Ligand binder design. Structure first.
Ligand SMILES: [K+]
Ligand SMILES: [Mg+2]
Ligand SMILES: [Mg+2]
Ligand SMILES: [Mg+2]
Ligand SMILES: [Mg+2]
Ligand SMILES: [Mg+2]
Ligand SMILES: [Mg+2]
Ligand SMILES: [Mg+2]
Ligand SMILES: [Mg+2]
Ligand SMILES: [Mg+2]
Ligand SMILES: [Mg+2]
Ligand SMILES: [Mg+2]
Ligand SMILES: [Mg+2]
Ligand SMILES: [Mg+2]
Ligand SMILES: [Mg+2]
Ligand SMILES: [Mg+2]
Ligand SMILES: [Mg+2]
Ligand SMILES: [Mg+2]
Ligand SMILES: [Mg+2]
Ligand SMILES: [Mg+2]
Ligand SMILES: [Mg+2]
Ligand SMILES: [Mg+2]
Ligand SMILES: [Mg+2]
Ligand SMILES: [Mg+2]
Ligand SMILES: [Mg+2]
Ligand SMILES: [Mg+2]
Ligand SMILES: [Mg+2]
Ligand SMILES: [Mg+2]
Ligand SMILES: [Mg+2]
Ligand SMILES: [Mg+2]
Ligand SMILES: [Mg+2]
Ligand SMILES: [Mg+2]
Ligand SMILES: [Mg+2]
Ligand SMILES: [Mg+2]
Ligand SMILES: [Mg+2]
Ligand SMILES: [Mg+2]
Ligand SMILES: [Mg+2]
Ligand SMILES: [Mg+2]
Ligand SMILES: [Mg+2]
Ligand SMILES: [Mg+2]
Ligand SMILES: [Mg+2]
Ligand SMILES: [Mg+2]
Ligand SMILES: [Mg+2]
Ligand SMILES: [Mg+2]
Ligand SMILES: [Mg+2]
Ligand SMILES: [Mg+2]
Ligand code: NA
Ligand code: NA
Lengths: 208, 53, 144, 49
RNA sequence: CAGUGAGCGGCGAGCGAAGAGGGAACGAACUCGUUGCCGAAUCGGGUCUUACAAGGCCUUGAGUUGUGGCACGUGUGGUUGGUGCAGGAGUGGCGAAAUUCAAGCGAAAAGCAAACCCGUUGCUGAAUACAACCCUUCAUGUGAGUAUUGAGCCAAAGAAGGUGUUAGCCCAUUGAGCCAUAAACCUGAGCGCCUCAUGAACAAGCGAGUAGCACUGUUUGGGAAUGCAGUGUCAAGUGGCAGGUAUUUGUCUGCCAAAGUUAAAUACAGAGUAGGAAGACCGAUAGCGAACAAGUAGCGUGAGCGAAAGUUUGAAAAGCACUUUGGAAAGAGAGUGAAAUAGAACCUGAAGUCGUGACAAAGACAAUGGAAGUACCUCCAUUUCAAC
RNA sequence: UGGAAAUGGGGUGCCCCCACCCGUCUUGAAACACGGACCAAGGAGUCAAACAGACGCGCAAGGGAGGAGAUAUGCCAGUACUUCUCUCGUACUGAAAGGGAGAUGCAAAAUGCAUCUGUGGUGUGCACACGUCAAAUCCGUUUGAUUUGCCCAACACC
RNA sequence: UGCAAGGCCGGAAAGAAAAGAAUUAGAGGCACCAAGUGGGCCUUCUUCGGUAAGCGGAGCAGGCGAUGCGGAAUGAACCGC
RNA sequence: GAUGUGGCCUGGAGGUUAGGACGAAGCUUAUGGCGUGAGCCUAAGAUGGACCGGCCUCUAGUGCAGAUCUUGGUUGGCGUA
RNA sequence: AACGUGUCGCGAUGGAUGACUUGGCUUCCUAUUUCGUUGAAGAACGCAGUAAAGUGCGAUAAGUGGUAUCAAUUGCAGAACAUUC
RNA sequence: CGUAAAAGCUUGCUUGAUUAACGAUUUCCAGUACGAAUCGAGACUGCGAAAGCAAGGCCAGCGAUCCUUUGCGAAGAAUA
């Protein structure tokens, strides 16, 4: 008999199993720990090779899209030319001192632009630049003692000089206002929703 | 909580005292245990009769 | 483990529990969900009512992120308030502030009796929830 | 003990007077024929015992 | 995300993705055409500078039916070319400790003193052995100590291989360290000289049989048509393309097709070269067809098909000298070896079948089988043998 | 104290009695139904994925990853550690636009008002508490019934 | 202040007498998961078709199938068990 | 046909406890003893020559009398046609 | 009687079992890692004192040259810088 | 099978052969569906002086998914 079971949909009707007549189509993960070890070793070797430069370049802070991830923050691809100009940097020059540049991002508001300019200013304040010729030092380049006293940043996301992404702070406890105690907010929200929901029909009825 | 293992504490025991023999032989239990009664005498070596007539 | 299976118990029985008469053949009733309307109709009708047919309108390119909208009830609000702040909270005084969208909720529903008054910031709210919280002494402020 | 999902699933959902839940992973699949009067027939919600 | 409250489907069987989020990687970006300003400043070939120089000189040879350049006084270049000089990595050789310590042979080169301590001490022997029905006489027999016991050393090395039995100290291996190097690789973009380059002083436009549309065909989850192909038709001008239900008309958002190059994170589902590391896998009818002169021997006109088979004697050939019977093969003696019951494709040597000796008997009930006795036997077990 | 006796096993023959050839399909096999000369080695319910039920274990209105990283870690394909996030669940319903669940009291407002130690009601319902009646009793107490209160889990009707 | 319905309060109750005046190897109810089977045949009483059949088709019950043992010399189903 | 078993047996793994050149595995049996049974243990070898037993967990290519079953060997017919 | 049957001791035929394993299968890693008209892969014929197959090699033919090492190779011949010819 | 001042015959007036908030049930039966049938509540009606009777002609006369096709979401009004 069959009885009461779920109706099955297991999707295994193609030649996926390797047998005496089929090559198969499979993927196993038996090399996962070895690959993890290899990646860590490569990162360590690359850090040794590029010492004393930080292993990861500097990146900006952006807001995630859609209404589901509106409240989250993360790292973007690169800094915008408007932000670089506000901080006082040529993009081509900035590309040579470990700053990522992205010419596509738009900067549609002032808050994100200000936060990115602050990140850039902090990085430039903390930067130490080696001279091309130590016998003839120029402006903006470090001295022999500063060059000797140098360390490497091996953080996963870089940002060892600017910190992690900043989230807005929480509100402190307060007391209810008279307006908040009197007014009904459901009516306000529903009226605003209906104003957009019934815009076309209301306009057409008016045009009569 | 542990400083290394975040939010970990030792599990709570199911029994406060694991010596149940002491509990079973304590005076408090013996006060409420049922009394021991006298039993019938053990059967003798001779076979008992079963024929009424 | 192979040592716990019925094969180990059935070594020597010659039929392995499939009978002498019916026997164990390959596919005695078709493969998969075959015959759902012809010779498996009783099973399909009594255990899976509503398997066949069409219903409703179509939505071609569905995106779930714009539809994201989780809810939380009025009597569950203490899950988002710290113990000390909850202890120091009474009607007429200072109340803790709860931000729903930072905790993963969008709408506030009004089931049950509220335990501790507070100020709730939410995207959506229901009539009963708004009325009950205002009567209890808290407040709701809209956010986006 | 009542109120468990297994208890809610026990029984056949296609007989008159039954309100058990079917075993299905896709919530929108098992509608239509046998659950709406417009699609052939509808399972009766009540039956005298 | 997602076997999806998307979607496709005799809406049956079945099929079936994308944006967002956490991550890997990432010094990641550049070149033509067109427009504007120049107009051979370009390329190839000879010849000379240590030089087929990104160099000088000469060339109608190519090229104006368009190569190429520029915008959208202190320094530098080891990726201009010619000459030289270092260190490192890599590669190849060389390179470590401690007992063949003492006890001798069939039976003490074995034990007991019941957690630990006594114990760097006490006490010994049911092997006067065995060798085929029993008893006397004479013979014959025990391979190699990595075993046992008692003492003693090495360890930054206890790690597995070899050696006639089971080895930290019999042998090999492994560490610090030493020596030698075509080019290439790494090092204030290592460091000098000549030559050569160079940072830095003094406005209009934007890729045409293309995109699109009609018919037909195929493909896709893509549904009044996701991508593509054939034919017909065939554009616009900062206007165009995309916003997952067709049309017309208004807004809004993103982007600018019809030219090109580009590392890493990913594959190696019957590849190859040079090196390595392993396994709760198989153990010679197994594991690759092939542990072996295996894609071999052999088969087929041919395309193709394709085995069986561990040479595993012994520690070491010490591989049976010599006598004798036989034409020979071989037999009977003798000898080597701990064993020949290890004698050559020789470790062990089962089942089935057969020969021989001794014994049990037995009609014709096919034979086999059960239950209960008895006759005869028994290299088997246990018990008893004295007021027991 | 023996080449001993005795009692159990083991072997072969004999007597009286009993007794159709195994495996299989089949209503029915011993059959004039099929497969069956002997021995050795080999020989058949497995692995993966989706779901459900019973049982074991951890946590609990919360449970848990996965991928990846970090350093003990440079012997070690293991173990130890980690954030956001993601997923199942705490709420369902409609084709959809959408909406969204406490109790009591006063009352009857087209979002009524007030309190917050609380099973929405009724019937049947472990244990516990208060009494009573039987039978037995080693006189300390036991074993059964029943009254009343609250009724846990659960069932039925609202 | 009659009938119908849902409740509350109180009483009575050989817990069911006597006349042949029941009995019980008499614990009731409720679920979850799953196998084999879905060719039958025989007999007793009642039968339908057929000349009839060790023939075909049904009703009630008991059996063989799935089961030996003791009897009818021998027999799946008869008698006893 | 279902289920249970401090139920039996085989190859390997994590632990623990033993054995062996004064003779391991394998092989032979009128070698008995134990268990209802699957099986376990001892004796003898006038056999062999180097490994291996018990117990608790883990694991699987884990138990043969027949498939006109596979491979190897043997065999009556037969000193016959 | 003979043939034949049964049990035990010994012996044949046969090649199972056990122990052994320079083989197979499977899983990982490293890099100055990828042939050919400057004639490849594959096919043929030859080469040793003695040499059928196989292995190596090409009329310089079981091999010439260079560096390292340090006394053999071996069935039997044969030869005989060790300062490393 | 049932029926006699009718359930038959004649005649008069009519459209209960309409709608009927997803009420319950019988027959087949797995206590599924389809077909047929029974007891009801609401609207608007017909006949009758009235109590009442009637949502076809009692009991056979009929049909899933997908697809095609028809009918109801009349005009007016909400500061939502
Ligand atoms: K140079
Ligand atoms: Mg069935
Ligand atoms: Mg079964
Ligand atoms: Mg079947
Ligand atoms: Mg619930
Ligand atoms: Mg899911
Ligand atoms: Mg497809
Ligand atoms: Mg130009
Ligand atoms: Mg040009
Ligand atoms: Mg010595
Ligand atoms: Mg060793
Ligand atoms: Mg363009
Ligand atoms: Mg075209
Ligand atoms: Mg297709
Ligand atoms: Mg390309
Ligand atoms: Mg073989
Ligand atoms: Mg083989
Ligand atoms: Mg031997
Ligand atoms: Mg031999
Ligand atoms: Mg034999
Ligand atoms: Mg018989
Ligand atoms: Mg038949
Ligand atoms: Mg038979
Ligand atoms: Mg016959
Ligand atoms: Mg047949
Ligand atoms: Mg969570
Ligand atoms: Mg955060
Ligand atoms: Mg739920
Ligand atoms: Mg919804
Ligand atoms: Mg609706
Ligand atoms: Mg009476
Ligand atoms: Mg059948
Ligand atoms: Mg018949
Ligand atoms: Mg049968
Ligand atoms: Mg009987
Ligand atoms: Mg007779
Ligand atoms: Mg195995
Ligand atoms: Mg025998
Ligand atoms: Mg097998
Ligand atoms: Mg066999
Ligand atoms: Mg030549
Ligand atoms: Mg209904
Ligand atoms: Mg109907
Ligand atoms: Mg009516
Ligand atoms: Mg129809
Ligand atoms: Mg209207
Ligand atoms: Na099946
Ligand atoms: Na040695």
């Amino acid at each position: 008999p069959k009885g009461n079971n779920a109706i099955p949909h297991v999707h295994q009707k193609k030649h996926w199993n390797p047998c005496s007549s089929q090559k198969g189509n499979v993927k196993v993960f038996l090399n996962q720990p070895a690959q993890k070890h290899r990646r860590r070793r490569l990162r360590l070797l690359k850090a040794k090779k590029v010492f004393p430069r930080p292993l990861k370049a500097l990146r900006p802070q952006v807001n995630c899209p859609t209404v589901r991830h509106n409240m989250k923050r993360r790292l973007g691809r690169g800094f915008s030319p408007a932000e670089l100009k506000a901080a006082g940097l040529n993009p081509q020059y900035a590309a040579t001192i470990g700053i990522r540049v992205d010419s596509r991002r738009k900067n549609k508001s002032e808050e994100g632009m200000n936060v990115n300019v602050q990140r850039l200013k902090t990085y430039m304040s903390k930067l130490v630049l080696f001279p091309m010729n130590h016998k003839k030092v120029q402006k903006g380049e470090a001295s022999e003692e500063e060059v000797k006293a140098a360390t490497q940043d091996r953080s996963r996301f870089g940002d060892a000089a600017v910190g992690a992404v900043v989230y807005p702070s929480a509100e402190a406890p307060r007391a209810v206002s008279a307006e908040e105690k009197s007014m009904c907010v459901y009516a306000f929200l529903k009226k605003n929703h209906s104003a957009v929901r019934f815009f076309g029909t209301r306009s057409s009825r008016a045009a009569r | 909580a542990s400083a290394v293992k975040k939010g970990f504490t030792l599990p709570a025991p199911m029994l406060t005292n694991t010596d149940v023999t002491r509990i079973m032989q304590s005076e408090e239990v013996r006060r409420v245990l049922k009394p021991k009664k006298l039993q019938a005498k053990k059967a003798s070596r001779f076979q008992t009769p079963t024929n009424g007539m | 483990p192979t040592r716990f299976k019925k094969c180990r118990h059935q070594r020597g029985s010659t039929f392995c529990g499939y009978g002498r008469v019916g026997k164990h053949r390959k596919h005695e009733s078709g493969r998969g969900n075959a015959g759902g309307m012809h010779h498996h109709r009783i099973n399909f009708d009594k255990y899976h009512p509503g398997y066949f047919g069409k219903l409703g309108m179509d939505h071609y390119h569905r995106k779930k992120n714009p539809m994201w909208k989780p809810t939380i009830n009025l009597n569950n609000l203490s899950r988002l308030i710290a113990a000390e702040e909850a202890a120091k909270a009474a009607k007429g005084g200072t109340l803790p502030v709860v931000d729903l969208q930072s905790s993963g909720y969008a709408k506030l529903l009004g089931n049950g009796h509220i335990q501790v008054p507070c100020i709730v910031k939410a995207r959506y709210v229901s009539k009963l929830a708004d009325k009950k919280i205002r009567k209890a002494g808290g407040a709701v402020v809209l956010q986006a | 003990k009542s109120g468990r999902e297994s208890v809610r699933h026990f029984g056949a959902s296609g007989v008159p007077g039954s309100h058990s839940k079917p075993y299905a992973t896709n919530r929108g699949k098992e509608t239509k024929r046998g659950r709406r009067t417009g699609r052939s027939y509808k399972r009766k919600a009540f039956r005298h015992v």
